[PDB]
Amino acid sequence: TEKRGRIYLKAEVTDEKLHVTVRDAKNLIPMDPNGLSDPYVKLKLIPDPKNESKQKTKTIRSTLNPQWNESFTFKLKPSDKDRRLSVEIWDWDRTTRNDFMGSLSFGVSELMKMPASGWYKLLNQEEGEYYNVPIPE
């Protein structure tokens, strides 16, 4: 439906490189029967027809408030001017398919103008690939 928690990130473009820091997320919704989840974050630059830009944080077991503190770097190219940084939280599972938890995205153009920083509301999978919602509140 709609409330999936929030995540704190930092993203910036410097000298043809995109730097992203995934700090932590709060109030995630349990996808595991146990009432918790095993979250990890997938980062990519889309569209990614060749599927070459994927990066992911480690999976943190049994928590609804993960603190990854991981940084990533993407080497950019001109065409990236029209791409977006997609950030998705998934719930790792031992025996079933991993479940989508929440996501968002930023335009590489957006970031070149203004770096991202702070808390953001997690969105549903489809919509997450098109926009982001800061939470300065």
> Is 48 assigned a ligand-binding role in the annotation?
no
Q: Which residues contact 98 (CB under 8 A, 6 or more apart)?
A: 90, 91, 92
Rounded Cα gap, residues 102 and 29, in angstroms: 9
Confirm or deny that 68 is annotated as ligand binding.
Answer: no
Is 61 annotated as contributing to ligand binding?
Answer: no
Q: Tell whether 80 is in a known binding site.
A: no
Q: Is 84 annotated as a binding residue?
A: no
What is residue 127's three-state secondary structure?
helix
Known binding residue 99? Answer is yes
Q: Which two tokens stand for residue 9?
A: 């990130």
Residue ranges of the annotated binding site are 31-32, 38, 40, 90-93, 97, 99
Residue ranges of the annotated binding site for Ca(2+) are 31-32, 38, 91-93, 97, 99
